[PDB]
Paper text:
Human [name] is a type II membrane protein and comprises 741 amino acids in total. [name] acts only on the α1-6 mannose branch of N-glycans, and this process is highly regulated. Mechanistically, the β1-6 branch glycan modification by [name] allows target proteins to be decorated with a number of N-acetyllactosamine (LacNAc) residues, creating high-affinity ligands for galectins. In this study, we determined the crystal structures of the [name] catalytic domain in an apo form and in complex with our bisubstrate-type inhibitor as a substrate analog.
We tested a series of constructs truncating the N-terminal region and found T121-L741, named [name] luminal domain, is sufficient for catalytic reaction without impairing protein production in mammalian cells. We determined the crystal structure of [name] luminal domain (T121-L741) in apo form at 1.9 Å resolution by the native single-wavelength anomalous diffraction (SAD) method. Overall structure of [name] luminal domain has a cross-like shape and is composed of four subdomains: N-terminal domain (A128-Y207 in blue and G337-P339 in cyan in Fig. 2a), middle domains 1 (H212-K329 and I345-L424 in green, and E606-H627 in yellow) and 2 (G425-Y605 in orange), and C-terminal domain (G628-L741 in pink). As both of the two middle domains take Rossmann folds, [name] is classified into the GT-B fold. As the other human GnTs also require a divalent cation for catalysis, [name] is unique among human GnTs. The four subdomains of [name] luminal domain do not exist independently but instead are tightly connected by two short insertions (shown in cyan and yellow in Fig. 2a), as well as interregional disulfide bonds such as C172-C338 and C372-C626. And, the N-terminal domain is linked to middle domain 1 via three missing loop regions, signifying the highly mobile nature of this domain. [name] luminal domain contains eight disulfide bonds in total and five of them are located at the C-terminal domain. In the crystal structure, only one N-glycan was assigned at N433. E297 is located at the lid of the cleft formed by the two middle domains and is likely well positioned to act as a catalytic base.
Numbering used by the authors: 128 to 207, 212 to 278, 295 to 329, 337 to 339, 345 to 480, 484 to 741
The structure:
């Protein structure tokens, strides 16, 4: 109400024609000014803000109210409340929220185990980083899952939101969701899973789209733009019922940083050994023994030749819940987290069999000083060729059993080898026996690293207030992908990551000239594979449907114009200027 009076006051003192500034960072401003010339009477709210038909009034409305146009210094900034978030160092409020429904018992038990580690981490982050003056956000979390990787991630996200001081409302039923949920521009963010999102749409019906900018959707395997755009997915013949939400794809939150079109949420790799356990393990030398990754004996089918090669150099151990198990294997059965990590500390090699795909267990092994033998996949596995991935709303390809371990950890902790190739396996086992490796845990999978990441998303990632401005455009590094290469690939092989919020700044002739791409001619297509550049004719094809901007996808004929950003080593979700 007073924001309307505030903007009207600015317009009352403004010239007829704003001398418009440079549009850098705001590529939709001019198109929306033109839209206002035709449409500022279609809704009385624009006039309620003081819009009077002058183009300067359009500009003022679009910058000050909707943030689609650059901000001008209309008013001075006054160099001088209760609304601030304070970090929490006590869990009783969170437990009392979860003590209402009973499949929260597993999560409460995990949080109680990890409580001291979480509290040390939030205190440590606040001692290193300036966390003052953050606004307390009102957050809804709806766990459709409740109506194991999924549970761990939910637990650590909820814990992180809580430790950072935000006001959380937890919903775990349709009835709870319905009661809670009862331009021109209560709850500010809504964390939800894929099951819960379907429930959200049904509870709200067609008006759900008014809340969609607030959604952060936990989606372990990721959703690519080709599948997120419902009409495009249909035009490609995709039969999967998944995807089709038409969200900004950065609103999907993944388990590992494998899909740069999405955001990486992750989780914490729990530490089960306390200081007494650790001191007792410095007692005992790590043995020349291996431990096979895989709890179900059916995972071991046809792995005998591979294990025999390992068995030539090392004892072979297992934790199996026994047809396919060689008789020389020492089976411990299922172990507690503490007993498992004791075993990992006496173990030189954690042996992947090819399945399961990208879980936490290899990171747990590496964090206890084991090397991981990581089977390589050629062809890479994807929804195109692997029954286990049928219906996934993404063509993402796995190049090994644990692509994160392959790409972001690597040797000497991770030896990515063809398990069928005896020479490659032997070369790895021999080098692992004679190598010095220390326990290693990527910062992003620690309590403190997860808090830093989630804090940055809460403070900086915003889809509800017009122009996306984070990561900052200063971080953009433009690369040309060759034909047959995706934008995801061309950033990754240069130790960068694709940043999909930057595509919109690379989508016309004038913008392309900033990066020494000169288009003699140009056209518009609605295609995930553009902006594209034909270097023979210097013909550019730009994006005609902004929801199809896509890090994934290789152009068969032309070069792709690809927006990369730097990432902080060990914190891939953030650029150095992202905070
Ligand atoms: C270490 O963990 C064991 C759990 O069996 C517990 O008995 C012991 O009190 C713990 N010691 C410390 C110092 O945390």
């Amino acid at each position: 109400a007073l924001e309307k009076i505030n903007v009207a006051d600015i317009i009352n003192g403004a010239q007829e024609k704003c001398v418009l500034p440079p549009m850098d960072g705001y590529p939709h401003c001019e198109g929306k000014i033109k839209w206002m010339k035709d449409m500022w009477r279609s809704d009385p709210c624009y006039a309620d803000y003081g819009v009077d038909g002058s183009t300067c009034s359009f500009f003022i409305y679009l910058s000050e109210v909707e943030n689609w146009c650059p901000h001008l210094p209309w008013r001075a900034k006054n160099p001088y409340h209760n609304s601030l978030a304070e970090i929490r160092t006590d869990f009783n409020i969170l437990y009392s929220m979860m003590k209402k429904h009973e499949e929260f018992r597993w999560m409460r038990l995990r949080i109680r185990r990890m409580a001291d580690a979480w509290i040390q981490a939030i205190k440590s982050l606040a001692e290193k980083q300036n966390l003052e003056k953050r606004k307390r956000k009102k957050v809804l979390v709806h766990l459709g899952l409740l109506t194991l990787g999924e549970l761990v991630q939910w637990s650590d996200l909820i814990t992180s939101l809580y430790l950072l001081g935000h006001d959380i409302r937890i919903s775990a039923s349709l009835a709870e969701l319905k009661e809670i949920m009862k331009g021109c521009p209560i709850v500010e963010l809504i964390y939800i899973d894929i099951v819960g999102l379907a429930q959200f749409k049904k509870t709200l019906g067609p008006s759900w789209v008014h809340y969609q900018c607030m959604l952060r959707v936990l989606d372990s395997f990721g959703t690519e733009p080709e599948f997120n755009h419902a009409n495009y997915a249909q035009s490609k013949g995709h039969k999967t019922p998944w995807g089709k939400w038409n969200l900004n794809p950065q609103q999907f939150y993944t388990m590992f940083p494998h899909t740069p079109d999405n955001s990486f949420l992750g989780f914490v790799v729990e530490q089960h050994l306390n200081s007494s356990d650790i001191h007792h393990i410095n007692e005992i030398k790590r043995q020349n023994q291996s431990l096979v990754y895989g709890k179900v004996d059916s995972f071991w089918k046809n792995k005998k030749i591979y294990l025999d090669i390992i068995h030539t150099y090392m004892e072979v151990h297992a934790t199996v819940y026994t047809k396919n198990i060689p008789s020389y294997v020492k089976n411990h059965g299922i172990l507690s987290g503490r007993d498992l990590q004791f075993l990992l500390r006496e173990t030189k090699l954690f042996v992947g069999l090819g399945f399961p795909y990208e879980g936490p267990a290899p990171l747990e092994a590496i964090a206890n000083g084991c090397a991981f033998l990581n089977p390589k996949f050629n062809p890479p596995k994807s929804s195109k060729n692997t029954d286990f991935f049928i219906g996934k709303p993404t063509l993402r390809e796995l190049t090994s059993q644990h692509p994160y371990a392959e790409v972001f950890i690597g040797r000497p902790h991770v030896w990515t080898v063809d398990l069928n190739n005896q020479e490659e396996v032997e070369d790895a086992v021999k080098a692992i026996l004679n190598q010095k490796i220390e326990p290693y845990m990527p910062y992003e999978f620690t309590c403190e690293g997860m808090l830093q990441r989630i804090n940055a998303f809460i403070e900086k990632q915003d889809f509800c207030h017009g122009q996306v401005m984070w990561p900052p455009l200063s971080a953009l590094q433009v690369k040309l992908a060759e034909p047959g290469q995706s934008c995801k690939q061309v950033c990754q092989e240069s130790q960068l990551i694709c940043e999909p919020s930057f595509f919109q700044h690379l989508n016309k002739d004038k913008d392309m000239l900033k990066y020494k791409v000169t288009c003699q001619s140009s056209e518009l297509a609605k295609d995930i594979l553009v902006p594209s550049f034909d270097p023979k004719n210097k013909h550019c094809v730009f994006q005609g449907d902004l929801l199809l901007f896509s890090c994934a996808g290789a152009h068969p004929r032309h070069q792709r114009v690809c927006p990369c950003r730097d990432f902080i080593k060990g914190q891939v979700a953030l650029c150095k200027d992202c905070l």
